[PDB]
Design a protein around this ligand. Sequence first.
Ligand SMILES: CC(C)[C@H]1NC(=O)c2c[se]c(n2)[C@@H](C(C)C)NC(=O)c2c[se]c(n2)[C@@H](C(C)C)NC(=O)c2c[se]c1n2
Length: 1182
Amino acid sequence: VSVLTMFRYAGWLDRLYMLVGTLAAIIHGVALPLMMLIFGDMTDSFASVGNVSKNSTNMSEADKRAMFAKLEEEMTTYAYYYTGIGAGVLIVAYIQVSFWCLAAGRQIHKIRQKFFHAIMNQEIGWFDVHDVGELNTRLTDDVSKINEGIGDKIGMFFQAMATFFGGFIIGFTRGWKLTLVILAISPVLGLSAGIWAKILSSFTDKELHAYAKAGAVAEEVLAAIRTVIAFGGQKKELERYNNNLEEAKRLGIKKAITANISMGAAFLLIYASYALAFWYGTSLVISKEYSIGQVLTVFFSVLIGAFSVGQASPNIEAFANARGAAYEVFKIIDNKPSIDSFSKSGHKPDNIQGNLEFKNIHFSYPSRKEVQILKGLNLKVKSGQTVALVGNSGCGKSTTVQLMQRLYDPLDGMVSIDGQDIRTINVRYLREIIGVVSQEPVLFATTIAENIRYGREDVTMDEIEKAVKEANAYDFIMKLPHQFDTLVGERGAQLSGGQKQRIAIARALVRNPKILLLDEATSALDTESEAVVQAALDKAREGRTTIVIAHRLSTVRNADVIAGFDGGVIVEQGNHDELMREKGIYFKLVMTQTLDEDVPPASFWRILKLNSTEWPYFVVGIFCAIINGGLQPAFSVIFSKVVGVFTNGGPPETQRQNSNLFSLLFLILGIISFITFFLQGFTFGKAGEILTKRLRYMVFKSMLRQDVSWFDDPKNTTGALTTRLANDAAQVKGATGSRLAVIFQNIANLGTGIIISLIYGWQLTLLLLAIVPIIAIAGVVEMKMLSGQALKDKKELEGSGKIATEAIENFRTVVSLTREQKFETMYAQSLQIPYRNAMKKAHVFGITFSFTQAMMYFSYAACFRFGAYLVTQQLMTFENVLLVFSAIVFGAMAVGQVSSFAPDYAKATVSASHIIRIIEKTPEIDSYSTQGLKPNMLEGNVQFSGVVFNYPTRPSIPVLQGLSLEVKKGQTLALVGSSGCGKSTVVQLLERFYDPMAGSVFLDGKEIKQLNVQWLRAQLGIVSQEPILFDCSIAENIAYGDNSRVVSYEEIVRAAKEANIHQFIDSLPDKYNTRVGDKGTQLSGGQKQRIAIARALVRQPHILLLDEATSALDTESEKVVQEALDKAREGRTCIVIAHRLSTIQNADLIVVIQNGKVKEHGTHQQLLAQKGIYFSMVSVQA
Ligand SMILES: CC(C)[C@H]1NC(=O)c2c[se]c(n2)[C@@H](C(C)C)NC(=O)c2c[se]c(n2)[C@@H](C(C)C)NC(=O)c2c[se]c1n2
């Protein structure tokens, strides 16, 4: 039910098609065992011919005839065999695939529309809860997973019937009890295999979780980069915990990694066992009873039943994860909670006009426990009026405004619009009859003409023309290029909020309600706009009764009636004057305000050379690799022998030949493997260990030393970096392992394959090499075609998913609701295309997979038939075919390698390139000389000649053009610009974070941008806006280890003293030991600054860089800061930049710089004597 059924709901000819295919799949897997039985019949007639060929020394003619007759006889059996099994595979395959598609296809599609629309119907709730971020996320993600659920499933039913039926069919029909001995030994061995292997595979899981832990403890904080450069360099810590947990869980999970190699070894060991019991049980039940040297069929075949149950396993899984998540989020899908709104039929009020009535409504927010914001609200408002609400403590006003669109249904009491109860009239009809405008003027990524249109589908640019003209916007739109058909550059980020809101005005305007609501629309907008806007707001009001909650008492004056609120506490009501007269709430309050990347340059073999560098040595590794390969073709050889010696050889010692080879297999495979692996696992594994660890150490430091425009102007977040750390150390690891695997399979396949290939027979060697590289190329192109369709599909669906998102993310839409479907409709359109396209590609996968399989039987037809070729009187085509097919097996072993081990080397290398390009870098300012700190450099006079610069993005026109400043010693250089840039950049330039484009600086005499970077940052009293202190203790923080500076106790005492933070240091549990406490979230910015300053003075600068230090503080914080800073200055030079046009007075040389160029300068009153820039600044101040 629910889970699975719903999960597969909705398909007539679909469900039928689904079944159909299913069947196909069945006949398919089964098709493979049949294939095995056959190899039986052919291998048996073949064995007969070889045994009589063994007797020989007699009737030469009777032999020409018996062997030719049997040759052509089976040569035919082969024709009709591959013809059979073959044609089959092809056909049904293509079919099962169509299941996959068609099925999931239309399925998903359906689920698609029903989900979009679903969300667009869950209403309020999608604002109520959800992450409405995480939602569209799961939108796309989940939908897809459901799909993969439908297709892989098909594949599952498949291999499920391949194992079940095959292992049955053969595992019971051929043997009678022999097939049963098979069942005995084979299944039992399959058990022990899957068991032990899986037990230690999960032991690997546990080891990997122990890793992730070691990982984060190998992560730490790596942001706060800037403050860090102005600090020095962590470098030990990182490395410490780094390699620490690394090496530990390294050897450890590498013990389970090597144990994983102990697993590939346990499985292979047991493999050998498979052989052991296999051949043994055979040799016996093939020498005594059931003498057919064809037990091979049954036994081998059931093996196939096992491996098919495996593949079956991952497929099922996908059906699960798909089933599970799909149906659960499906429940959050098809489900139609709604009912607190909905969108259909309802009550129709043609009466047009009416009065708003709020009759005792008790409302609690959707957050259950949240205290009812409308602890009983009574408020009626006549038509034609314009009532405003006033509050301040948040949540109540906007709340009423809110439920006026029926948004949240009232918890109790009710509200009657016009004279009928809001809850009784149709919702759409309501929402349309209710024009509203909140603060956020949301605009869609389209043209103005549109946004408007959105407000109302049908409408001619004519009406829009007037509408806007009325919403007074017909001007900027005009002066705006493209006219009405002007887009809004990806979202509502291309014009002033004033304009935006305005447009909206227009929007809702064209809606022309009867009830207009303004949720502090004007709010959050410059004064000027504020006026023009209010203006429009008015022009649209008064013909429409309107309620308005705002803070601009100024725009509250023209109120036909004011509403007393301040967080959900109704009170005084009536005209402005009446409330002022009431000297209550109004009066008072009125008087209270008066992650993408991808880089072209890769790195061919470069990673392999730098590979070796990051490697001491491990021939031992490559060695065991090689021998390992040799080990594989070996089994190949030996097997051929076994089957051969027994299918055509001498009757005596048949048991010694059998007991020998089978025993051999065992010792050979099992022992050399478990050993070859373990051994390598240890070597190559340790390889990845150091490589990673060491790699990190370098990469990280490379960053530490790195810096300038890097973190100064980065687009490489702290995460992206940290990640880079982990992932890439790991990926290169995969680079060395691959290289290992490469040499391996190679010599394995290539080498041994060719050797045995020379002892071939020249018919087989060639026909087969044609077959392996060919089916190989068909597999690679198979994948390629598959990723392609997958990629392009993700792009069309993307577009569709981007818009859809835009709507759900921007629920505001609902405000007009005049688009829901309209929207989804447009998406139906896009969806429409990738749906027909999903069909085409469907068929595709079909023909592809099929053609694959084709190549399969085909290859077998050629192989066996071409092998057996001419065998009249005994020709060079006998048992050797085994070895030949061993070469086919060899190609298939190489496939086992590229489908296993370290990643496809691809992402491995790309990630390798990244870590390289980074570990490399260009230091730019590490150690050096470039000064000697002569006992007479302790001045501090800063010089700025030319000063032209502009952090990386030069075509944005430099923010430093021909600048020039200067500053004496032991004084305070005042600095004030226009805003943001200029101030900080200079400070920066001093810190030499960015070497100016043209010009230079002089901290005292020598040339800054030549002086010693290290020392120039040794003396520096830096304290910018947003401070910061690592999750250390204040004592340590205060004692900021700039360099060899040993945490000087009495020194730091000096820091808390002057800094003015000794207050928190006095008492407050632990005194100096208190860790910032949870990364710092326990001390006010004032405090943190106090420690900031402590830092500076702790370094005893000769220059103090104050970057608006206190610029988001308050009482005694700004005061105590300016005082500590007061004694913190004057003994040593200090450029103090700031936007405190008030406390800047106390300055020696105040410099008024107009971004790029300084315009005025000198002493305060003097600048005031210069009525102009500085003047207009203190006057705007007031
Ligand atoms: C592929 C199916 C037709 C069929 N095999 C043959 O017809 C065949 C004819 Se000679 C022979 N197998 C012997 C012999 C060469 C030693 N094979 C191996 O020692 C060997 C070692 Se790993 C490996 N195979 C992988 C690889 C090949 C995928 N194959 C299978 O798990 C598998 C399961 Se059923 C099956 N194969």
